[PDB]
């Protein structure tokens, strides 16, 4: 029981770094790559957990 609690209650802090696509876009990059990564990267960042649905079932 204690393991599951510690497992669920483990805190995650790693200082999620910010990406400056303009910097990489300027210094050097393959044409269409830096932009393709940004648009695809941003799309997944929008997705987030649906805490509401889980809150109800439990």
């Amino acid at each position: 029981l204690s393991s599951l609690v510690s497992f669920y209650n483990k805190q995650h802090v790693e200082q999620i770094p910010t990406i400056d696509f303009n910097e990489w876009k300027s210094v050097i990059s393959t044409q269409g790559l830096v932009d393709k990564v940004k648009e695809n990267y941003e799309s997944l960042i929008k997705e987030q957990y649906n805490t509401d649905a889980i809150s109800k079932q439990i």
Binding site: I16, Q48, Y49, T51, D52, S55, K56
Partner: peptide, 29 residues
């Protein structure tokens, strides 16, 4: 920015759980 989303979602689950207090009213009825 993800931390801002984390805190917002965190409070959501709290309010959703406290809603269980409404279920207690069902028993009284």
């Amino acid at each position: 920015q993800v931390a801002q989303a984390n805190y917002s979602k965190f409070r959501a689950d709290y309010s959703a759980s406290v809603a269980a207090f409404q279920q207690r009213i069902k028993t009284i009825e």
